Amino acid sequence: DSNPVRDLVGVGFGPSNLALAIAVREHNAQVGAGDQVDARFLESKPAFGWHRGMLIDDATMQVSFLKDLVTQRNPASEFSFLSYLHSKGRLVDFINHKSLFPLRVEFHDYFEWAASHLDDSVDYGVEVVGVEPVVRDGVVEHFDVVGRTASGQEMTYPARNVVLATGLEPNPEGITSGDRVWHNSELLHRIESLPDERFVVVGAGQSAAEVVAHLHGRFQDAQVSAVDSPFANRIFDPSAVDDFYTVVDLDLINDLYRRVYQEKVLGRERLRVLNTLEVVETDTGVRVAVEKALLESDVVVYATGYRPSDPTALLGELAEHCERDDQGRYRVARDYRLMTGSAVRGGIYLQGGTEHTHGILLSNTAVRGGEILRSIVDDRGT
Amino acid sequence: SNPVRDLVGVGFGPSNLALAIAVREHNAQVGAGDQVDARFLESKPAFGWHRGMLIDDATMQVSFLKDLVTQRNPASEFSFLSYLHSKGRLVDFINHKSLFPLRVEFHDYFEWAASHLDDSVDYGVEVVGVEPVVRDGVVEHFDVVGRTASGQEMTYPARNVVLATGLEPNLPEGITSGHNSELRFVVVGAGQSAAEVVAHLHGVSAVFSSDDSPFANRIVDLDLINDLYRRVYQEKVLGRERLRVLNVLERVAVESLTTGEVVYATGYRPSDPTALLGELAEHCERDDQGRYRVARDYRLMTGSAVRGGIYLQGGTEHTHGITSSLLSNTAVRGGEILRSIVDDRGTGMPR
Amino acid sequence: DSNPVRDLVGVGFGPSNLALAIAVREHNAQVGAGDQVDARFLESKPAFGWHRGMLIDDATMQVSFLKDLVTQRNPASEFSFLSYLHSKGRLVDFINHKSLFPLRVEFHDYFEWAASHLDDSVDYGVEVVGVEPVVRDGVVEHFDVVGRTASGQEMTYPARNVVLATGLEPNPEGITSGDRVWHNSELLHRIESLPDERFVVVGAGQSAAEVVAHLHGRFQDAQVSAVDSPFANRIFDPSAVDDFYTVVDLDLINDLYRRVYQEKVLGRERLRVLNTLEVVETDTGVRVAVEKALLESDVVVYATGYRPSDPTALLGELAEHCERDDQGRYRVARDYRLMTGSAVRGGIYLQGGTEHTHGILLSNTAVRGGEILRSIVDDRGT
Amino acid sequence: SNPVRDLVGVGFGPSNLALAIAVREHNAQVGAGDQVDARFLESKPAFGWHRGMLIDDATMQVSFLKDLVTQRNPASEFSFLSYLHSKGRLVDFINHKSLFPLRVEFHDYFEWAASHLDDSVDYGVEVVGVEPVVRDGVVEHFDVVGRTASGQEMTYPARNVVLATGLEPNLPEGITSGHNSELRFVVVGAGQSAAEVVAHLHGVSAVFSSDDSPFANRIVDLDLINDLYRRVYQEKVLGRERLRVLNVLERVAVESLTTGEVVYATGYRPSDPTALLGELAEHCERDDQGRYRVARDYRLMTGSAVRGGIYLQGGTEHTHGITSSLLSNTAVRGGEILRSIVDDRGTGMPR
Numbered sequence A, C: 001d002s003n004p005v006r007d008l009v010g011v012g013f014g015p016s017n018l019a020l021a022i023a024v025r026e027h028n029a030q031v032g033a034g035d036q037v038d039a040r041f042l043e044s045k046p047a048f049g050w051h052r053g054m055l056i057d058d059a060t061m062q063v064s065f066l067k068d069l070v071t072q073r074n075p076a077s078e079f080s081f082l083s084y085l086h087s088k089g090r091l092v093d094f095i096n097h098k099s100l101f102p103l104r105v106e107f108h109d110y111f112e113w114a115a116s117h118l119d120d121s122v123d124y125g126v127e128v129v130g131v132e133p134v135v136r137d138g139v140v141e142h143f144d145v146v147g148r149t150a151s152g153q154e155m156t157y158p159a160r161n162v163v164l165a166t167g168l169e170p171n172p173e174g175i176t177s178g179d180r181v182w183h184n185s186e187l188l189h190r191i192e193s194l195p196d197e198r199f200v201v202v203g204a205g206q207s208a209a210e211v212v213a214h215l216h217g218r219f220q221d222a223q224v225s226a227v228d229s230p231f232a233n234r235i236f237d238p239s240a241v242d243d244f245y246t247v248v249d250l251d252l253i254n255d256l257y258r259r260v261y262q263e264k265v266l267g268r269e270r271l272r273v274l275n276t277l278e279v280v281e282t283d284t285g286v287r288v289a290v291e292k293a294l295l296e297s298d299v300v301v302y303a304t305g306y307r308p309s310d311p312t313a314l315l316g317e318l319a320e321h322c323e324r325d326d327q328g329r330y331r332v333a334r335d336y337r338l339m340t341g342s343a344v345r346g347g348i349y350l351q352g353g354t355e356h357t358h359g360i361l362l363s364n365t366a367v368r369g370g371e372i373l374r375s376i377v378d379d380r381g382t
Numbered sequence B, D: 001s002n003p004v005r006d007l008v009g010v011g012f013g014p015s016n017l018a019l020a021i022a023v024r025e026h027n028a029q030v031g032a033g034d035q036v037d038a039r040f041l042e043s044k045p046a047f048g049w050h051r052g053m054l055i056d057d058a059t060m061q062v063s064f065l066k067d068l069v070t071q072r073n074p075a076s077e078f079s080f081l082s083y084l085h086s087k088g089r090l091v092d093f094i095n096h097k098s099l100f101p102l103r104v105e106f107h108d109y110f111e112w113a114a115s116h117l118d119d120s121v122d123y124g125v126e127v128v129g130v131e132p133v134v135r136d137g138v139v140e141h142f143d144v145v146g147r148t149a150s151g152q153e154m155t156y157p158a159r160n161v162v163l164a165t166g167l168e169p170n171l172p173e174g175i176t177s178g179h180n181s182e183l184r185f186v187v188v189g190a191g192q193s194a195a196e197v198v199a200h201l202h203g204v205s206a207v208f209s210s211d212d213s214p215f216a217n218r219i220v221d222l223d224l225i226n227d228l229y230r231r232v233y234q235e236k237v238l239g240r241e242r243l244r245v246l247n248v249l250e251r252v253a254v255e256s257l258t259t260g261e262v263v264y265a266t267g268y269r270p271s272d273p274t275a276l277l278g279e280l281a282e283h284c285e286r287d288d289q290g291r292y293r294v295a296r297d298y299r300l301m302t303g304s305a306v307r308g309g310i311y312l313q314g315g316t317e318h319t320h321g322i323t324s325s326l327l328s329n330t331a332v333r334g335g336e337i338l339r340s341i342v343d344d345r346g347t348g349m350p351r
Ligand SMILES: Nc1ncnc2c1ncn2[C@@H]1O[C@H](COP(=O)(O)OP(=O)(O)O)[C@@H](O)[C@H]1O
Pocket: A011, A012, A013, A014, A015, A016, A017, A018, A042, A043, A044, A045, A049, A050, A051, A126, A127, A128, A129, A165, A166, A167, A168, A309, A351, A352
């Protein structure tokens, strides 16, 4: 009987579920030994690690440090970004720097430092193979979260609740990937594996923008062929969609068309912007067409963003029990609970993919996490 | 009387409130034996950084991060961010993607912090002097002497005393009124960021006055710079807007330099503590002009006669910048002063 | 026989036809007394005058001085904006000011100064009442442009060619205007005629943006209720649509949502942004509804831009002879000639409304004008 | 020999080309009697502001409007805008919504203008001196003396002579090589906009060194300022990029101040004309240090002995700014010099 049932088991340990893990810690401090919340998180990766694909070593963050794992839920937290700076002695230098936006690498080390303090909360290298329901009076009292190590042994994690923050996955029509057709996230692990070349960047958003620039880079004498404030007050009021349920960068804008202009002016165009079918990759690149030009090159990157993992497999039996919309997409409650019915007594909660897609995110990770934890504690008693 | 306190502080504006906040976060973490007993005495009957309690609706040129507490402890319940959270404006502000809040928000934040720390302060008390408590020509502690609005006198034993009485307008020979804050065919004033007053004056005739980036804020507003150069440029054909703004001698006008056409304007300097010191003023080291020297721990430099400390939290230089006493080190200096007091409290004294 | 036939008669004398008038002058200088182009322009207004509706006295121009009447066709012209500065002694102060964008008022005086030198080229207060064709062998050799003074007398202007730059007109569904329902252009002539109030600004673009701000303004303690680089390289190459024929301001963005934010923060909201039928104007404002809220106020402004004058009336008989698209909209040649057929021997050319709408313009006034004039001179001989 | 020309000019870089352009636009407007006969003599065999003829692909920090001609006559066929029109790049540039062209475009523009004015210039001619042509101790005009690459000498009568030989690197006691333009474990240099060289150095160890807005450009690049402060800030943990950039004594290193670890870098100064003047140098007024005084019309101040003028177009101060001799007044000063020459050509002489 080494596995009694936990209050919560979370699947995945990226930021989203780390943010939650933090609130479980801060909650346990305020409450006594009788109201502790017992949370375990399971990460398939052997160690904590956000995205390896966009580590452009001197990019600044598109988002303000205030959107860290914790602050929008609790601004007095030992695990805010400012708090991490204080422990590495950089708070003053950062406060003086008079910016909202640090480098993408400080957030990575911040994530690593948060994930490090909360290391007891997680088993890494454990891949969840299913959430199977534990039934009594035709009621699912709790779940056996089943996990597999990298050496094959299977484990059981009883939990009244399950939280899904498995992260997301590359994407609408194009459904293939070889040795010469990459996704925007593959660019670093592959640039470091190709060594005058030719590229093509289908895409949208800053994702596709960032490749056209680095394909230039301190790098290529070759060809590369491309194919803030609106949400500062579209957020507006702290009310959101509770009255109704009752992708550009000005600096990169100019930097790239500058390159095209200056290259038009001086003739030596490393760049070629394009505006407006099948692909036939042989060994000499690819024979993909556009409405018509069966353009060919060496490699062809994209940027149609990311999408949340589909949980049906993981749900197994329970997938059937979940309310759907008119398309069979999963409905989601206001407290981020999958809609299962009174048949199912515990909850299955969602961070991550909830509604949206396409964003290389953290917009509300902190507050959603705490709202979930309070939903879990409320359901445990008055 | 009282038992001797770890520190008695003079004044309760922003500077001393930061210290008070720092005193509290200390007393929580440490046991009941390492508690610091700090009292603050404020002459005004209520807290008010601005006694005019009716200021602007511009943004602050300083990032909210220079609040009473953050730069010493970013995990504090009394950060500006905490204050927003308590008003449910924390989300709106994060979305607003700014470093610089409105002038009124910081005022309200000061007021909100000063309310949480009401127990550490007595208002309506004007400290009139520190007479040294001596045995053997040695000052063991201080009697901070204060008088209410009714004349009654009270005494406060303290091993340490902290001065954060704030500052004073800087005026040379001429002083009149009929300063930069007091706001017709002629008035007067001047300043280096008086330009920041000059800008809004648009919309009557008045009279007033690189290698700068390394390591950042470790040392004028570019936007008002530009608005002013815009305004003067756009003002080809037509002179000054609604007034006649222009930038030395004395129904009264003043002449100025070789040829020249009663409120004032200038900068700031800290209150002189000599009066408050009385006897002890002479125990204090001075520079080659007799000005008060100040240690690294912000202690007045008093002889070995004096065993406790006299500290300065209220900023001690000629700042020339209102609402910038924060961009200094109020938070961190406060904590540094606080740490100085707990240290001299345990040493068995080896010189 | 006091009216022989002119090479060109132009209808209207705003910028578009003034730009053309200038090229007729510069052309006449280069050529001898035998190849002179005889151009007359007719303006209904009694004097030259662009838009009276957007004279916000310290706005800067949205467009660079290089887009003046002349420069993109001839950068060495005595009637560029820089040239006008030189004659008022402001060239150095302007050159030193190190900006591309002067105030909207300097362009107005520049327009007035250009229109002043070219004053011989125009009769003002003459309203064109029709372009009627002059026929011989079933061929229209030239046109009688017919014009009426403000005192009723009618005049005839024979011209081998006619150029239409009548300007544009307010606009999609809403087709009415009273004493309490304005267009974006009426705001000044009406703000200066109203004297806590209430407004409503339907609209789009910077047009509607500019009213929400001034309705605040150094003015109203009242309510106001709202309802660059992309074309720097979308222009790209100097090739345009000859391979294929073979609305925001960052400063105003922030300035307005700043107002809404600061007003949310401090409670005293003079502003109310809105996001997502019939109107029933009685004497107490108007009873217009939105999908539902039959909102009422004092006045309701719009900003659905402008559209070109429809020339069918002016064409009279000739309107029938003009090629149409699949909707009956007028087709337009590459040289800006209405498509009439070999029946019609002279041309009828178009500045202004050509294809687009919605813009409170000058983008190509200079080059289009010269292209038209050369089309007219080419058609006059080898 | 020649008949006496209105002006003979020394050198044919940017400064003197502006004048040459101004001389031409004059000769068009005026009749055949008021034509100005100007010759220019350039030592180099071909025009080249930069003799290295292989410069950068950055933008210019100066607006194209400071071209050879515009600020004197914005209606000129030899504006930068005209040059673009002639290459069909005028539309692309207007759409590009910039004031600042690429460094190569202005170079090519200079070359294009210098080609149109080939008739006004003789290349391969090194002017060696101005010997005064006297009758009655009075200098009526000048013999500009020049020698080709083959030693042959030629003479040029001119009522006026214009000096625009350009400038010189400024170096104190130490001069070596093994300057700011010439571009290992130690080199050397310095400057105020040497920072502009320091910036691109990123991507080996080297060694180098408000009330500013009224009325605008009537008096460092903020963007490179920021890139550098970014670079140093971002460089916490890791030192200098690819090198070891740092900012006085002499396989060779130099020590510097109290403690310190062969190309150079500094600013600029104009060529000294004393040699070229010879005899006449003494006819020229000087300041309290013997330096050449210069009139409002840019004339060397020579006595009433000398009836014609000697003018300076080649910028006469210590500029400290390459590619900024335009932000001066080349266009307008050129025209001002030209007007000075036509005026002294008609006066019946009343003093
Ligand atoms: N079935 C699974 N079992 C365990 N871990 C998983 C499973 N599916 C995905 N993961 C892990 O979930 C994590 C999600 O992290 P990430 O994608 O960075 O986004 P988030 O910030 O939303 O957590 C990844 O580390 C991924 O390896």
